[PDB]
Symmetry: D3
Subunit: 285 residues, 6 copies
């Protein structure tokens, strides 16, 4: 109570709660993204004092019952156990009617989530903010750059209605994934880019995943794999806000590595983005 993200209530038995949205922390890397959820929670008090978060004219916590269920408990080193307890957690939540905002953690945390969400929402469109496309063909079982190769192959997402925003590194130009790379995103208007995004997604249900490395290192230095020429936090937030009218079933923010943060501005970016992900959900009501 008054102890989680944004001073929301902790509830460690959330499956039968009245919550609409459950926040879950997943401290996991396989560096230093393990403390991402702690850092995000700790800095979110910056945001909590606004009754109506700018620029909105209503309070999210009045339109949505959001609870923080803490962090996922699993064997210290084991990633298989992480992955299985994460998908299990996610399935039990979805079956109870709840929706998920999730804090990472390694981006790999997303595969368990997509798997669980796919069972309840069908094949999904992926809106992916990152500097990496994370479609690596031959990597380790738990590599965090291989999950959006594995997800289409397991029929979890449809590349042909997915969009990858802020890319700045080598990628495969023929996946059916539409790559809106940081170069053009930075040189195009937010409206322009949202228009193109909406055209691709359709009315398909969306999973929204945001690796913080998508922001330029100056705006978000606290990440393990930085790439220069990224987005501003102002552009990120405007883009996220522009996704209001999509059918976003679930969402997560990942790769925040507090050990490389500077005066918390990377955790602040994640907490503000996570809150915007909530407000756009509340604004559809």
């Amino acid at each position: 109570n008054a102890f989680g993200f944004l001073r929301l209530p902790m509830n460690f038995q959330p499956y039968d709660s009245d919550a609409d949205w459950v926040i879950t922390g997943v401290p996991f890397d396989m560096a230093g993204g393990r403390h991402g959820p702690a850092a995000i929670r700790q800095v979110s008090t910056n945001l909590a004092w606004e009754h109506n978060r700018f620029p909105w004219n209503f309070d999210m916590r009045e339109r949505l019952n959001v609870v923080d269920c803490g962090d996922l408990v699993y064997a210290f080193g084991d990633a298989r156990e992480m992955s299985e307890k994460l998908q299990a957690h996610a399935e039990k939540l979805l079956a109870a009617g709840k929706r998920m905002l999730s804090f990472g953690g390694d981006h790999f945390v997303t595969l368990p989530l997509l798997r669980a969400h796919a069972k309840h929402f069908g094949k999904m469109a992926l809106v992916h903010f990152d500097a990496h496309t994370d479609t690596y063909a031959n990597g380790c079982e738990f590599d965090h750059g291989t999950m959006f190769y594995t997800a289409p192959k397991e029929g979890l997402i449809d590349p042909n209605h997915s969009v990858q925003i802020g890319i700045r590194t080598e990628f495969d130009k023929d996946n059916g994934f539409t790559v809106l790379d940081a170069c053009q995103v930075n040189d195009r208007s937010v409206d322009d880019v949202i228009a193109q995004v909406k055209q691709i997604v359709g009315d398909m249900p969306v999973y929204l995943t945001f690796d913080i490395d998508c922001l330029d290192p100056a705006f978000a230095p606290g990440t393990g794999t930085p790439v220069i020429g990224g987005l501003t936090s102002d552009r990120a937030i405007k883009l996220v806000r522009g996704l209001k009218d999509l059918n976003i079933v679930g969402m997560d923010v990942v790769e925040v590595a507090p050990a490389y943060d500077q005066s918390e501005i990377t955790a602040l970016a994640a907490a503000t983005l996570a809150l915007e992900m909530l407000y756009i959900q509340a604004a559809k009501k």
Copy 2:
């Protein structure tokens, strides 16, 4: 002598000096006390330029600026800081001097507004910040309440005031014109300045600049950060675009050196401060 901000002369008895502009540091409340120190130390970066770019003249040739050090007051006592600070300002103003002031908590502006209102009348406030600082029901010494109190005491006129760079909850119905960061970041400097001049009119202006207006990327060293702010480039051009307004006093506040990174925030504040001085000099 050669020891204060920008290697300007220290003068701890400025009231009868032949200085036009007096720099005053006010170390007051986290940890924005070293704001003035940080600003002065980093300012030597700028001092070597004879004509600070992009100006084609030397501010120091057109204006006598002296740095009078920091305001002495009972260490924790805030009611002393205010009375000592207003008195300082009143005596400087009566002697014909003008003030560039370094914070320090943003609250320090309210004493300076009281002092300035007695000498210049009701003012227009040009307010760069991420917060509107109009909180109605707060502690008498809360930093985010100065622009609720000031209109109520008749110091400033909301209806010619403007609040630039806002990124947090505010009050749309109170007379202040709020140019939010979302907007300012998407609009040209000329567009915004035009609008600023429209609202302000011919009226006299007190310019207050809370560094949290700048995005934490450029001003990480602040106590209450908000993402999606202004760049240093935009902040400096906007400030430079107020040349033609009647700016009677000015301050830069909320630099918390504990959270600064490679002295970036203090550099921005000192640069902005210097630009505030050139605006004055380019009219003389």
Copy 3:
């Protein structure tokens, strides 16, 4: 596997199958610039094709890193002389130079060696400063582009200075594209004007990292607010492909003032782009 971008170290590069040689020049807190740049560059090494390129620079050029220049602990005079000798023998053997600072001063020896082998050059200069101070000490950064034209090394009248944010001289023949306008103009616009100024002349490309705004390059000794973004820096560099760049360096990185290695990463990324735009013209 051990030098910049996991390239081969070759401490005997004068006779070698390499077409380009990377040389660290630790010199003054920019001693450690070259180390910082190498260490962070592994972030880029894993990309077969460095985005947004369509091929691997490593398959179009043999590039080797011969380490750092050895000179007397404090003697800058030996530093200069051993630096210019180093280049003269590299440039002599039909090998090019990407060099890492280090003090910006390091460019002046390199310009002396380059002028003997390519003639008077156009200077493409990324910096917040113009570095043209006449009445300055013998070994001093800032003064090089007063000395270099008087020694007939570069032609101011085809030289361009990009990102300037500080006091400078308007009447000396250098074209200054200050950070105020560079940030308000399109890259294409600026590149067009660069190409117009330089013409067909061989260019030396020098990049003082303070050109970037301190938010992006905090790790610098002489920082100035209101500079360029890394995005704009990289697009401008990339836009110089069609010019004839004979030599290039990246200087002023100071790790003691770096934050989460972002200055070093910006310099390593720019340096890699300087290599790609070379590889772009040979293939």
Copy 4:
């Protein structure tokens, strides 16, 4: 559940729990608010040890410890923090629980002393700090005045109290025995502990630990640092040497994470905290 300090259970309704010891965080005033957060985050470093060295048993097997989170109070209001904090403590104490408390400003101890005095009588204070915190003429909410006020309100008896690690000006004439850092650093642990036991007697003890007691080399993360302090090794052995005293409550305060370096200070505090728990457990 598995979420609080040392991965212990959270329980936000601890008053009727079957817990022996309750951990409470009090975020209050620079920037010692994140003291509790910092302590909890770093504490996982210790949690993996089943028998925390050098003990030959597991504290968690002998004691039910729960973490009840942080004290909620009106954000800036300090008079609320005190009344809410004393009430919290009184209700826990009446229910038979004992308190390990994380600061937070050192001032938080005075409410906890009021609560404890009602349940345990007048106490002996064992006080590790670089400051004596006995300032007579201060603000009602000044951190360095709690051990002037507490004797005057009859909460503690100076004549069985001891102040360990002092490195700054103090008052020799007020009943407290002051073991200065110069002395403690030159004397064996057994020597000092002998003396501590002599002074304290059989009387009940409240153990308060301000982290600035540790030399800034080991606890850089503090707001008022003083050189020539204690090592973490000496601090932990001294604390461990109080096993036989009747310690009724305990706290660790003044961890300012903004000034911490690689989480060293928070680690020391959490380790010391855990040792405070083992002292209790080794008597049960």
Copy 5:
């Protein structure tokens, strides 16, 4: 001039006039340990005779640095196998090893190679942890000195563990000199007991940097308060001269958590002492 302590790099060290070879083993935030250690070591290089010694180690041993071990980005199994192969071929050619971590796990391959060439060894272990966990993952730091005795690589009964500050097993044959007593006893006292435990057996010297108190070595991934000072660490290492040390490593340095480079400097200084005490016995 480019490796540790400005020693020569030699990427082909198997046939070389060197008697000792320095090898970085970047492995997991200890990837960057070896770099950090090399970069800071120049602080020591300028001393002809490293204090308090009466001669130059560099004039009694040929020491070279062959860089870092090349292995698959994430495959630790290849890391181990290429590491043990590396050592087996070095130890085979009559060359010794000072190695830099890197994860402490790196020692286990090195112990496998060393045991084949020197037999079962006494372990002199500086760490806050005993690293004897039985029921742990295949590749995991902490478990090595459970695996190493079961594989007959070391003899617990002549092995000593110095600086322990955490849970451990009292009954397994290892002699634990915990940081509580080590800090309360004289170096001579402790060295005497070390010499008594080890006897005439060949020793492998492994130094996990968390042994030092976090105040002295902040840059570590698993820190524990109440550890050793660098002064005491260096005096203890120095006191092992008369023992027969066949191989040595320094591990767990994590720069992401270092403060003003003091952890790296402590490790580079210890490593240099490990070299002097070798040079002490040959001259």
Copy 6:
């Protein structure tokens, strides 16, 4: 006024003031010791609130008129001008009857000071706290490791009554300088070491110079040339305090490089040592 070190009065015209002791800052390196005096001043407020600085039972500022004259103004790059304006400054102060506590800055700052002091006090005994002996035979004209070679050769100090405390690096064992190296200093009692110091110095006038690198890097990380195995701040302060009965004519603290400081603990060590240097002067009265 109330603006210098320890909130003491600034006085930029100190030669004819009533001060006994003048504090002078010398921002100079030839890295990053230039801001040493600023850092020292800024952190000294930590100390200023104690009326009687522990462990003393009197107030220094009651027994001594101490003023801070600011920093020495000279040509930005030129060290010759630094050196000459520094010695000139020092001579004018000494001739006026004033005594000097000086903040560095590069250790080289000491040569101008010794030169000026020698003219007024004669040949001096040097009490030197540092990890380096600074007796380098062949270095640059302004090398900061060569000044205590140059000073005996110019007849400024007598090595045979000088003592070098906390040494941890290669030095020349036959200078007549008595080296009390950190190894033994750390293993010997403070009384023991002071006794030996007093025996060597005699009643000769002492210049006390303290390079902060003498402290172990953990206690004082903010220096350019660190060496491990140094002294604690507690031992440094006790030793300095033990020099009360020597005839210390002048004093300085040098090499504080704020760019490598951690939470100001290096500047705090210098400011506390500098204050102790003042209290021992006041305690003889």
